[PDB]
């Protein structure tokens, strides 16, 4: 694929923005966030299978990547959605929350605060949609590569080749916009350093989920495999 | 500073490699690792104060950065030390451990495994010492920038300016070595993506320390401030 075709593939693969399920005519938070994220995950699977190179991996490796990255992907999506809404997190168009509304759950305002900080950072850098889809694909391919035989060596080589292709695509987007070569590598670095903070927020979020001690709230490898291991009957 | 002078400053600022304290004539693990890391932290402070731009920050902001980054810095140092020792972690020249020797502590082999994976990754990329010192400085300036007034806006602007200068330095190292422009941004991206895994390992390690429920094992803000807030009487 060319860089322009890579971008086009990623934009067309974008998942939709889902709504929270609550009667708007009625006067709770963990349940809304749980239901929303669970519905988003199904669309995640569909999106990941359209990330170029992802379906060339073994199904086992596909599951490992999604297992490691799913919460990071949910959060970067949230941060991107919330970019143009200072001080608020657009979990859904009908669920736009501020940090005060997170005080009703222990541990929530801390996570809200980091998401709000990342969204403000996105805003100051004026993150573009084309950069955002590249970053999200990078998360999917990178976050689990470190926890994977002759086959595994070939899978890791392919992942790094795709990641390199995404780097080239980000640089190409930046060159097309008229940035100097110095501005290009400076902006590439700034965007990739943000991914370390997204990892950070995900780990804090995973801590919260595991503390909930709920059977199904963290998606199992078997569930993720069931979702990814689709048949060809449709 | 020029890029060559930046590199020279970072190399000269490097901390020493400390030894574990144990009678080698005698026949335990958490205690050795605790003592070693605590002695390393004092040298960390000295090193951080020599990272160009770091001492231009407020002392409050200096402490915040070190509080967020100290375990990441310890682990990248470990991974770098262990690079030329496949399957082992060189905690110290007299404490070279394999993953089997981590099975004696619950949760240890999992952390060992991620450190070993990162060290193998360093080895395959043939990480250079000049790149390593740049990456370590990036960790110090980046890992806490998201949890910080007119003064704070100026502090964050300065941090991003220094980070941009470190990006330029990494690219300069790569250009001097004869890499193409494409190889330069591909390698920059590969190195910065590794920092997301170092964040990951640090968060898992922080989880372990907080579970220990030991008063002094996680350095307090006040302790870090006491260490950083030095007088000019020597
Ligand atoms: C798919 C498998 N089962 C998912 C079940 C599930 C998922 C998420 C949560 C809520 N959670 C866990 C980190 C959370 C908690 C907070 O304070 C404690 C603050 C913010 C959050 C996220 C922040 C990102 C985010 C993005 C979205 O797109 C949608 C929701 C959220 C909530 C509960 C249960
Ligand atoms: C400075 C303030 N007080 C520090 C007190 C302290 C620090 C560290 C640890 C041990 N720990 C916590 C993550 C650990 C535990 C493991 O399994 C459970 C495996 C590996 C580790 C690290 C891996 C990196 C690393 C690098 C070094 O340069 C030296 C040691 C280590 C151990 C205990 C107590």
Numbering used by the authors:
A (entry chain A), B (entry chain A): 310 to 336, 341 to 461, 465 to 550
In the authors' words:
Estrogen receptor alpha (ERα) is a ligand-dependent master transcriptional regulator and key driver of breast cancer pathology. Hormone binding favors LBD head-to-head homodimerization, helix 12 (H12) binding over the hormone-binding pocket, and exposure of the activating function-2 (AF-2) cleft where transcriptional coregulators bind via LXXLL motifs. SERMs and SERDs are comprised of a heterocyclic core that mimics hormone binding and a side-arm that disfavors the H12 agonist conformation. Rather, H12 packs into the AF-2 cleft via an LXXML motif to sterically preclude transcriptional coregulator binding.
